[PDB]
Amino acid sequence: GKVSIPSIVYDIVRKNGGNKILLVGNGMLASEIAPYFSYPQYKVTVAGRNIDHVRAFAEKYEYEYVLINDIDSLIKNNDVIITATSSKTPIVEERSLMPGKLFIDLGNPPNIERGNNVITLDEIYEISKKNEMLREEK
Known part of the structure; x- marks a missing residue:
């Protein structure tokens, strides 16, 4: 289970299967995802x-x-x-x-109107924290 935010974003996109990406942003977080x-x-x-x-x-x-x-x-x-x-x-x-x-x-604040059809940074941190803990267990 991946923990870094860009690693999780990549994995979600990979599983989705789409290959054309619109990236609306050019700051630090965008810079972390680009690689x-x-x-x-x-x-x-x-x-x-x-x-x-x-x-x-x-x-x-x-x-x-x-x-x-x-x-x-x-x-x-x-x-x-x-x-x-x-x-x-x-x-x-x-x-x-x-x-x-x-x-x-x-x-932050939201660039996209909120709802079940849009996953947010806070939700990706939920994944991240759960994986950070799970990978320390067992």
């Missing part, structure tokens, strides 16, 4: 509202990048959406949470 997703295994597009920050982050991990305009266009074209930024209100509202997509919201 786990590389072309050609994965096709990551980094998206953000601040284009110079997005570009610089994408250059480091050799990712495609885009300025967010219509987030539905981006969601339609990807299998997995991972948010890891700061937004006053969700960047992705309920009406955009299409079927057959995996949504992982690592933002």
